[PDB]
Structure 1
Amino acid sequence: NFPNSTNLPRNPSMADYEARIFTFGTWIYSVNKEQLARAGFYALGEGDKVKCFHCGGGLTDWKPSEDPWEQHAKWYPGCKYLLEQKGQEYINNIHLTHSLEECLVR
């Protein structure tokens, strides 16, 4: 299913931070859940799979080193929530970084 790039969220029931934070429960995984919720992610109950309330973007198999906002921007750069909370400059920083990380090896 394609990512949502409209200014309207795909899952408006998860639009409030408090709604999202309730989805995790006891969270054993490597990335802090409050951080995941602030980046707009709620939990699916399927290991450490999160989905963005706005773009619907899904992310799984999180490493301890990884940042929710960075991961959000890498995989779901079209997201209007991300663009609202972080601004296009941040997004360009993140993408230049990830594209330069890729090239410093491949």
Structure 2
Amino acid sequence: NFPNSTNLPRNPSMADYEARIFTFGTWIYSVNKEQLARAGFYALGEGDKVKCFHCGGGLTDWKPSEDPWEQHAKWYPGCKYLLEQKGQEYINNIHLTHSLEECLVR
């Protein structure tokens, strides 16, 4: 399933922060649910699998050191919600950071 790069959200029923927050319930996973929701994510109920309301992008297997906004930019860089909330400069930094993180050890 291709990522949504239009200015229109794929799941408008999940456009409000509060709506997204209800999807998690009791959340045992290593990444904060408030932080996930702020980054546009809602829970699917399949372990720690989340989806962005706007781009439709799915993310799974969260480690405690990982950041929702960073991961969002890493895997769904065409997301218009992401661009709205963070700006292109932030997004550029993240890409550069990760691409460089490769030629550090990898």
Q: Identify the TM-score tier after normalising by the shorter chain.
A: over 0.9
Deviations 1:55-89 (A, max 9, x none): 00000000000000000000000000000000000
Deviations 1:19-66 (A, max 9, x none): 000000000000000000000000000000000000000000000000
Moved over 4 A (4+): none
Distance 1:103 1:52 in 2: 29
Distance 2:93 2:78 in 1: 15
Distance 1:71 1:86 in 2: 13
Work out the number of aligned pairs and report it.
106
Distance 1:15 1:97 in 2: 29
For structure 2, the residue ranges without an aligned partner over 5 or more in a row are none
Distance 2:50 2:102 in 1: 24
Partner of 2:96: 96
Partner of 2:36: 36
What is the TM-score when the length of structure 2 is the normalising length? Answer: 0.99
Q: What is the CA-CA distance between 1:9 and the residue it aligns to?
A: 0.1
